[PDB]
Design a protein around this nucleic acid. Structure first.
Ligand SMILES: [Mg+2]
Lengths: 94, 97
DNA sequence: TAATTGCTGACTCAGCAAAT
DNA sequence: ATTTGCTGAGTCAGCAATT
């Protein structure tokens, strides 16, 4: 209360609450519920920020992948053109 | 009742004019109500904008994934055209020209 | 030498479903 | 099942920029 109450367990809890005032059995469970909800919000906020960075990282790595392929296209264009000229210049061999 | 929509569009100068003569613990209550209503809208913008930034990022990823596919196609296209023009050249070299 | 605006991390609650 | 976990909407506090 409030730190051994969230960390405490489903049975262990009911062991510590066996003869408890039946209106304070409800109050303590309400209290713990609320404290956990606070921790869920903390995860939810956290998960959101992690997904956001993950999405932006994916965007970055697609951008640099495009860049790689841009470099290859230009190499291959040149290599093809080296042969196309070579090919055409032989064909005028006459 | 007292429609919120109007209370938030008002100026704090215009509001004071309205409670020209007015109770104290209700004046303080009413200005704080106004703020709460504004904070509600501020929260919505925050929420709405970030889902929209998420969707925009998701589209951007989609647009880029496409360009990669197109580039990959072009890559194998050029490599094959290189090969074809090379094979044609070596054959022409064989005949001797 | 005030008070208001807009933003945002954090909390609380409702309701929804799955794991326990 | 109960409790758990998650998430959108609201509320508040407190910060800086604005008037
Ligand atoms: Mg029941």
């Amino acid at each position: 209360s409030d730190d051994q109450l969230v960390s405490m367990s489903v049975r262990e809890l009911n062991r510590h609450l066996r003869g408890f005032t039946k209106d304070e059995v409800i109050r303590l469970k309400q209290k713990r519920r609320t404290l956990k909800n606070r921790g869920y919000a903390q995860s939810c906020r956290y998960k959101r920020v992690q997904q956001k960075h993950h999405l932006e990282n994916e965007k970055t790595q697609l951008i640099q992948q495009v860049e790689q392929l841009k470099q290859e296209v230009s190499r291959l264009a040149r290599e093809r053109d080296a042969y196309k000229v070579k090919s055409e210049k032989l064909a005028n061999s006459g």
